[PDB]
Assembly symmetry: D2
Homo-oligomer: 384 residues x 4
């Protein structure tokens, strides 16, 4: 279960580089130079790294400082063969964004958020990123009067529409992926789930340029089934990136390493990504716990990739098992895939076997055999 860059595992700079500051605690680790993280991740068998503008270039940097930071980073990428598939903007840390970036009540802040983002899209393209993530983590409210959500959605559409116009105007080959989260750090966040984000995207001027970036833990913070949400995204053709991590239920955003948290959901996720042939990178957005030193940091990142690979093997063995293929037919998963009424409406209305002569009790007496199927899945996961 050794990763190679062929597995397309990617990590944010802000993941392994998290210093360990939390709402109740100071940093437990020193800051990492992005150069050293590139090198360390490459040695573990990662394929690439991603970044927020402010992870790579300190906020307030001069043109000349900005150029140096990027130069050094590009040299580490060239020294290792690491790629940058994705970038994103920090619209959440600085106090100016305390009420939002794109949906800040202050219009001047909204304009500044757009300009900060556009500056970073140019950088992303320069580094070869083809996906640009937006996580509106400050877009929302703690109280009901502070934000009119209809006006905010108008502002959010206008921002995303302006970005689309920009990338179109530059001829850039980049698409956007909107990252939903239900809460934290705001009391409630706008576009709280994959579904709200998919629906929002269908109202944009150029919907083909935008997809979702679902994160395991964010959906699980609302008690939702992350595999189900990913399936809806895939069904829609809008899964443009994915963030992998662990989460133990409905609480603060834990960002555990992928595989920790809800292990069976992590199995069904890998099963789905692999069976759908998802072609994007397997991106980890996690935090090594503040209890850890740097050795524990690199062990944590390695564990993300290892767990993916074990689950990939177990899911592949599950689908390939003749006994599972038989159970899947016993549970009528093959019938779920057939059209309900390819014969058409009128034929359905004229079919007495669909109503007048349908034996509801015999249909009702047929067991689904789902427990046998699920026990086979558990035996495969556990290698029993």
């Amino acid at each position: 279960y050794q990763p190679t860059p062929e597995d397309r595992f990617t990590f944010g700079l802000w993941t392994v580089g998290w210093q360990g500051r939390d709402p109740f605690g100071d940093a437990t680790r020193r800051a990492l130079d992005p150069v050293e993280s590139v090198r360390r991740l490459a040695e573990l068998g990662a394929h690439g790294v991603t970044f927020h503008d402010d992870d790579l270039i300190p906020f307030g940097s001069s043109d000349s400082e900005r150029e140096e930071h990027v130069k050094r980073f590009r040299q580490a990428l060239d020294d290792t063969g690491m790629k940058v598939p994705m970038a994103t903007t920090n619209l959440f840390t600085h106090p100016v964004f305390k009420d939002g970036g794109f949906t800040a009540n202050d219009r001047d802040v909204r304009r500044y958020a757009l300009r900060k983002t556009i500056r970073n899209i140019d950088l992303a393209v320069e580094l070869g990123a083809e996906t640009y993530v937006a996580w509106g983590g400050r877009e929302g409210a703690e109280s009901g009067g502070a934000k009119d959500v209809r006006d905010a959605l108008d502002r959010m559409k206008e921002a995303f529409d302006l970005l689309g116009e920009y990338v179109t105007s530059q001829g850039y080959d980049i698409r956007f992926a909107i990252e939903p989260k239900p809460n934290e750090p705001r009391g409630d966040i706008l576009l709280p789930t994959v579904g709200h984000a998919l629906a929002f995207i269908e109202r944009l001027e150029r919907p083909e340029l935008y997809g979702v970036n679902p994160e395991v833990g964010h959906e699980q913070m609302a008690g939702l089934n992350f595999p189900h949400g990913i399936a809806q995204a895939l069904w829609a053709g809008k899964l443009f990136h994915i963030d992998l991590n662990g989460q133990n239920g409905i609480k603060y955003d834990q960002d555990l390493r992928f595989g920790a948290g809800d292990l069976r959901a992590a199995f069904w996720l890998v099963d789905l990504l692999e069976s759908a042939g998802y072609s994007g990178p397997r991106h980890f957005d996690f935090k090594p716990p503040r209890t850890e030193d740097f050795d524990g940091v690199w062990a944590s990142a390695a564990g993300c990739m290892r767990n993916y690979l074990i689950l990939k093997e177990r899911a592949a063995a599950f689908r390939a098992d003749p006994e599972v293929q038989e159970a899947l037919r016993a549970s009528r998963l093959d019938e779920l895939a057939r059209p309900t009424a390819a014969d058409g409406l009128q034929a359905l209305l004229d079919d007495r076997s669909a109503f007048e002569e349908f034996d509801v009790d015999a249909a009702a007496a047929r067991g689904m055999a789902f427990e046998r199927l699920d026990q086979l899945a558990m035996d495969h996961l556990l290698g029993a």
Copy 2:
């Protein structure tokens, strides 16, 4: 705070008629004749009643029994002046639907679900209903292998598309409202939130025929902000019906009377419905607690309407208060409503006040004044 039929308050038959059976308990009340509920609700000042096919006509009824049940019901409606604005199908109670109706793995069940629904659409139109609700409460799974969600969404689209073709083919003036719920009775339910349902609707062959029917408690069972979700539905133009009730947090679906549960969220909901000029009926989907006798049943229903009316008065007084109007400007709610960049992209890119000369620290130092605003809202709610 006395309701009149002008207030357009409606109730499901299955609400006041709930006998009190729960997963751990037998019925505590006898069955109500829909005639008696019509009369009792009219006396309390309700405007109308709604129904599942099986609330009005016992499952398995002959043509002649079906005709009698409907006759008697129509006579109560004519005796009282009560309307039927909405109907829906029961695709959840009978054992045949144990794995779904429209997304049952068994294709024969899917065809029967469609036919049962189409039969009830004809009845609804006959009674004057202009909205038809669909709550796929059995559509989902307890385990990951039992349902391929992409195949299920294909089946769900095909069902809703067939229904749309039917109503179009009959020239009926009725629209559909899809009711999301995240779980219960399935482990996870397909289209779990307002957002997932809005996004689904945009993939149907005739999206204009379908909206959402959000229910207070269903969104709150995922820890989501129900006013925020309603605002997104309104923004989309897809709020085709609403279900009002109470819920105390993330647990089983309580169906408390509207006003119980999350009282401040109920205030911000009424504020939003009234300020948006929502024109649909104020429909209550609640259960009088099994502790209650019939006197408590009618008190519970009366309390739904009373609480709405009190909250309507308090929200209206909040928005009309000059001191609140001033606080709203202090918090820049007027600025949230202005376009971010009506000047256009190029002008935003050339505006140095948006970036090079933007004073981020002075912007950041400006307080939002949201606590003053929220305390005014609390003072109004409480009449302090």
Copy 3:
């Protein structure tokens, strides 16, 4: 991973016998004769069965009917070698208990609840049960004025004290195990967690006669860590019974088969029970999903036992691995087990290495190595 009666696996009659009625659905299975469940469970390798009074003897039964039901049941137990380690009373199903049994506001109901329970304690002793469970599932409220919780706790203490006096007065060798649940079917249930129940027990007249019966799913419905709660119960010496099942997070009580739900928590539970040498039976309180026929019922029950046995093997291999024993020392689990100050208070106050000369920064720089340890645990669970 084949169970034998030596493994001491037990099942409630109401588990495999659940007909599949839920709040939104009719029964999907016919009723099982307790005789047939005894036989079927014995064939699967169970050790015993447990019961509510009303699972074994229909409510309202004559003396002569009651005698026949018990006779037949005793014959199945004698035919199979199955034991009855535990019984309990149904104080929740019948409408009379709609506001409680022991804490019903109506005093006459409280007296009847006591008498119904005492009648069943005599039966339990007759069948050889040494543990008597009490689950006050109706003890609680949907609204704040309906129950004064201090008066209710007085009533609950008086009931448990009366029961203690009874068993003492009869010389019976039986102890009680109070089963906490945070909600469902009441809005909030009294003694909602293991902790509330442990604390309550310390106020009873004879605390040695009472322990807790924690259930996996009940603690998880409050988002609590079930292994942690069990460790507190063990630390207190009050783990008198345990109920094993699965639950996917904070939602209605799912009662999935043990092993489904939170798989890693199920691993750490088995690890703890086995390492503490818990000597009680491994009791399953689960419901085969209503999707299943009887073949699926027996597969579900078999899966409970199989999953326990797989997890027992994986936890045993984890603790026995020299590399895990080394990681446990690297993480200072051996130091957690040593007394903080066996030297005494005065020596701690006079120890400059504890304060004036304590190097806080060198202590703070030491990593805990918890991610390495946890990845070893994950590798063992998965057999990687």
Copy 4:
């Protein structure tokens, strides 16, 4: 609804002094001198202030710096008439406590935690505090192998026992109040609820010296009913302090001003505190949202006190209303307060009206009238 120091409202220094740093954000406010907070709070009508050692004296301070900080603080208290009823130790912020204070796996850290606490108990007594709070916010784990909870509870008992021995040995008049929290910042925290903390306390060498300090939001983060928990604490005689704030459901710890969050639960809490005659201070542990400037900070604190006072008036009017007193009798709240069997066990066993002649159906048919009662409570809360 103007507070006076007679109302005994208290605030932590760390409340109004919170700079606004969160897991995703930098500080939005400058640091407050504790002198200025004392003055500002006194002007708003607060009675007192509380503190962590590190809120008043910067970590690492010399003896001479420590003396100056305390001097200045004492001068503000003398200038205003503000009291210090309570203090507590910071065992969570500094990196040295990343795995705990009293239950850190490293024994040297455990000894340092004790000494840091003992130093602050001496200060507290010097300032006149009679309650000392302990919030073990780092005591817990993100993973199952990192903490053996039985060993940790042994360490926690030993620490609390040592503290008890210290205060006894000094003749100090101070008691301890243990503050439960279910999670955050640890994945799961030891003693997660009021119940776990009450039960723990009964195992200490001198249980009379320890009580609980329940916080509204902490219980609500587990979805528990905070009034119910407070009633159990009162019933036990262990409510030694209380922390008041707001929380909207199961999510990260919001620390909203008291009255925001779950408004009806805040009503039933005040009802209970006032009706039980709780004599401790009404302590607010909240954070003014980071959106606010200092004007919003003082408005937020004022709003805590105002909301308490409004709710106190509404609860008092509810209990004093003859129509509510009648409803309370209709719902048999008077009967809940009577002993179930003051006649004794033998008389209960010989009473045929408790079993053989008990009419279960007539008992079952009696409605509880709880909805009428609850609507009266809602009308009072809203002043309708």
